Structures are given as C-alpha cells and as structure tokens.
Design a protein around this ligand. Sequence first.
Ligand SMILES: *[C@H](O)[C@H](C[C@@H]1CCNC1=O)NC(=O)[C@H](CC(C)C)NC(=O)OCc1ccccc1
Ligand SMILES: *[C@H](O)[C@H](C[C@@H]1CCNC1=O)NC(=O)[C@H](CC(C)C)NC(=O)OCc1ccccc1
Lengths: 300, 300
Amino acid sequence: SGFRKMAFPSGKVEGCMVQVICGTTTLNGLWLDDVVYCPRHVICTSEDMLNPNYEDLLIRKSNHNFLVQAGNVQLRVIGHSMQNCVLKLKVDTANPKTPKYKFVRIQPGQTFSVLACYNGSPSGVYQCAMRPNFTIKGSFLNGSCGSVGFNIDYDCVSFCYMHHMELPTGVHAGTDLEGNFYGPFVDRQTAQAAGTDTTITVNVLAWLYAAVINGDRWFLNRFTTTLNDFNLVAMKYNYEPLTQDHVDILGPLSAQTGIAVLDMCASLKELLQNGMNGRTILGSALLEDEFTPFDVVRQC
Amino acid sequence: SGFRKMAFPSGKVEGCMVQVICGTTTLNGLWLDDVVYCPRHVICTSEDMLNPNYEDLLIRKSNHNFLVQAGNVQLRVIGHSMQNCVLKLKVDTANPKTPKYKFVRIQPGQTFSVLACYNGSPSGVYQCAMRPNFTIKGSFLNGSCGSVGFNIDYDCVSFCYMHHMELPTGVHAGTDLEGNFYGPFVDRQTAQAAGTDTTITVNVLAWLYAAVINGDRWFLNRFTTTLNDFNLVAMKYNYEPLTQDHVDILGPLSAQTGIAVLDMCASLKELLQNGMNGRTILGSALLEDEFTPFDVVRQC
Ligand SMILES: *[C@H](O)[C@H](C[C@@H]1CCNC1=O)NC(=O)[C@H](CC(C)C)NC(=O)OCc1ccccc1
Ligand SMILES: *[C@H](O)[C@H](C[C@@H]1CCNC1=O)NC(=O)[C@H](CC(C)C)NC(=O)OCc1ccccc1
C-alpha cells in the first residue's frame, strides 16, 4: 500500500536528450531517429525575442549555426526546418536509442511525467497535470526549454509536451511535439498571463477512492446526492462539472471499494462545505486533483 | 521557478533491475557486475516466514533453485551466499550496463529516489525521506521487494535502500545494500510496529526558504528568536531539536534570501502556534519536511 506522486521511469527518454546551441542560446532537444526537435526560439537573440518574425530569422540561418551535442559526441546538422513552434534539425546519425514512440496531444486534466533537463543532461523527473487553463505547475529554470513530458504504455513512449516558457504567476507553458501550443500562449514577449483555473473534479474523486483503498475513511458518510445537486456545489467552489462519462470512468474504483460514485460525491460536497477540521487525507490537508483515475488504478 | 518533489532520472538503475524467482516467490534483484542482490526472504515459504532460520533454509538450496531473468534473458546462477538480510547470487555474466556505484547508508532526514519495480520491470519513480523512526512512506505492493532507493551525484549511483516489508501502519521498511535493516525491524513475522516519529525541523526550514525563493512571503515577520527558545517550541510540537550544525547548513539559503536562520525560526514558531489561516505554502496546507537543504539548493 501507500500512494505517492509517481513518475514513469525515465531511461527511455534520457537516451533521447541532446543539447542544442544557436548563437548564445543553449537549450535541450529530443533526438528521435535522425531528427532533433527543439523550441524554435533557440534562433532568437535578446532583441528579436520582443516581436520576432521566425520565418525571417530562420532563412538567415544555416545548418552550421546549429551545434548539437549528444553527451560528448557532436552531431552534424544536415537540414533544418520549422514546424509551428518547434524546429526539426536533420542530423547525419539516427539515434540508436530511439524507443518506440508516438506524438500525442493531451487534454486538460490528464497527467504526464516531465524529465527536466539542462545542457542536454537530465536533472530530475516528476509528475505534472495539464491544468484546465492549459498551463502546468512545473519546476523549470533557465536552460530547461526543450525538456519533454511523456507517458509510457508497455514499451512505447507517448510524448505530449515540450517546454517553452514561464508565465508571470510562475506556472509553465509549452507545446505538443508537433509544435502547437497548449493554450492561448505565444513564443514571444507579451503581457500574456494564465487565465482562470478550476479544480479537476473527477481527479479529486479518484484520489478520494485512493484514500479509501489505503485506509483513510473518516470522510465517508451514508448520505448520497444527485449529480445535478453535486454540480451546483461544484460550480460554487470553482470545480469542473461532473459528467456521466466521469461517473462511468470511476466505475472500477467504485466497484473495488463498494462506494457508489454519487456517495463519494456527497463526501466531497461535505469536504467542500466544511473543510477537514484539522484532519488529512493521504498526507494532505488539501483536496488533490492531479491524479487521474488511471493513475490511481495503476498504483493501487 | 517552481518547486516539485523531484526524483533522480532512473535510467542508470533501470538497467540493473532483474527478476529473481525461488519456488513460488517472485521479487526483484539488483544486478551489478556479476552479482545479483536481493532480499533473503525470497527463499522462504508461507510456513517458514513465521520464525525462519535462514541459515538452515539456505543450506537446503542449490544454485539451480534461483531463476534470474534480465528482461528476456535467463542468467545462470553459479554461486549463492547470504550477507545479513540480503542474498548475493553470483551469475555467469557481468551486467554490461553496470554504472559507477557505491553502497552508502543514509541518515534519518535524508532523501532518496525509489525505483518501484515488479517482476524485474520498473514501474515508477518517486522521492522518499528516511523518517526519524527509520521507516519510509512509500508506495509498494506485493512483488515490490528488492526495489531500490538511490541518489545520483555526477555519474555515480549511491544505492542506499532495498525494500523488504510493509508495517501495520502502511509505512515501509528495508535494508541498506549490505543487508542491514534501517531501524529495529526483522525479516520475519512479528507484531513489529513503527516507533513514534517526529518532524524533521531542518527540512521544514529549507522548504520555507524554497517558498521564499519562489515568491511565497506571507509567513515572514520582522521578529527573531533565540535557538533555545525555538527548541522549546519544537519540543512541544514534536519537532526535532535544531542544532548549530543545522543553522550552518542553512547558511547558503539564508544568504541567498537575506533572511537569517533564526528569523525563519521565528516564522516557523508562529506557523506552529497559529497554523496557516487558510493559506498555503508551495501548494501545501501543511509544513513539509521531506526536502533537505541540498534538495532545495539543487532545484532552486
Ligand atoms: C527556455 O529555457 C526558457 C525557460 C524558462 C526560463 C525561466 N523559467 C522557464 O520555464 N524560456 C524562456 O526564457 C522564454 C523564451 C520566450 C522567447 C518564449 N521566456 C520566458 O519564459 O520568459 C519569462 C521568464 C524568463 C526568465 C525567468 C522568469 C520568467
Ligand atoms: C516483498 O515484495 C513484500 C513487500 C510488501 C507487500 C505489501 N507491501 C510491501 O511493501 N514483502 C513482504 O510481503 C514481507 C515479507 C517478510 C518475510 C519480511 N512481509 C510483509 O510486508 O508483511 C506485511 C504485509 C504483507 C502483505 C500486505 C500488507 C502487509
């Protein structure tokens, strides 16, 4: 037993991380087969990064302006192109460590693991959720751009996130691996800011089921509620509405614990209206919303 | 910016994990050079595991009773021996993926990353602290024994923990890699239970410094306190006493933020006496004690 925020083992991704330098900008790239993917802002200078025209900036570059280092081996760049907000650097060597992979775009409310990297060297691994407002609450410093987020199913790495920037509130923004931003954000200097966020209700419910599986039962009750009455409470507390599909997704956890989904909703209603009264659930004094139902089943 | 519970990248350890079967018991082993290390209870049966005599149990075994699988390759066991609570299985092939490594024993209050594994296959990675009572609050199911904890410095893996058991409160116990238990626990069936735990004060202080570095300042004050007066409060709230060595270790974080250690102690005294009044620090409504000063410096 026990329940922890757990990342996927990172080895398969560590073998794909490289360093990309253009001018005085250093960041990370992802080396899959004979292509290195990286944020296109690697080509910008301080002056450009106000309102850059990336198509102009890139036509002024040559293959030799991109220095790619895979550990202690220089990779020779033989072609370059832009795809949305990522650059694709063709190199003369296919990565022999390329795993089976896919490029997937995730939905708000879904989780993934982040391999934070600096100078092409992995530094740490942690779990993130894509917030309803399309930001992530990560841990990223200068040099971390090009770090990736991913899930692993069987032997296949599904890459979902590449890191590009930090917003004024300290949260993080980036793109899918096709270079399309999550959320209404752009890789240039504006006053852009995260929009209002909400709590991921289906995930809070999943985490309450994880708590019951692990022996925390104090918040349970015999009462029940209707889906409509629960969603009235959710709206008041800035929680996302619960759909019948969410109820269906929680079915397996409800069956395992014998607690009907709408009974757990009544427990959550009481927690929202009364707080915890100095108690904790799975080591937290707040309701946690960054575990999906799948994350709970995977671990419990 | 941002601050997350972050594990070390696990690749170097993933390449060392194997499956060990003896009889009907399956668990994990650690394959370094031509030795596989695993919990000695792999040789027990249901009846034995009450009060086993491991020396007797092991003399009745042969090399061929140990089946070792490295991915989809069977390793041939050519010798076996017991070292404290671990078995050392000599195999006919040195692991070509053996990293530079050390076997270190950690202290209570120190952190490490855990690579949870089942059937010799890594499942997830997370950070743990060794509690003052020599347990860890992990996430381990049947089959997870032999999973290891480790830190990485430069290119060298310092293995510190091998998993053996779960105590009645749901916390976890295990040994160093020389097979010596952390804490007063034994690999047999008794009514053994975790002793009383305390909060790791130096780590709470480090995490408060991480909060300031990341823009949370509401708990700061102009007041200060004496070390003796603070330790009177620590005792009342079941916090470990703060030593001058802890103050020295916090020096760099104090210098970076300009907040003297004893000023931060005054803030902590107020948080202990008054709580948070509905506010949060780094996304928590509780005081977090599983980040060391080094963990904070590493990330911030
Ligand atoms: C790429 O390494 C970098 C990652 C940032 C740096 C601080 N925290 C991160 O996540 N990205 C940028 O510096 C980015 C470049 C634009 C052309 C998209 N701009 C950015 O994040 O600006 C905000 C900022 C910069 C430095 C510190 C704090 C916020
Ligand atoms: C080895 O895989 C296993 C790990 C346990 C199983 C449940 N959670 C864990 O961390 N260790 C044992 O089963 C261990 C064997 C003794 C001979 C040391 N005994 C143990 O942990 O017993 C308590 C327990 C067993 C099963 C479920 C819950 C608690």
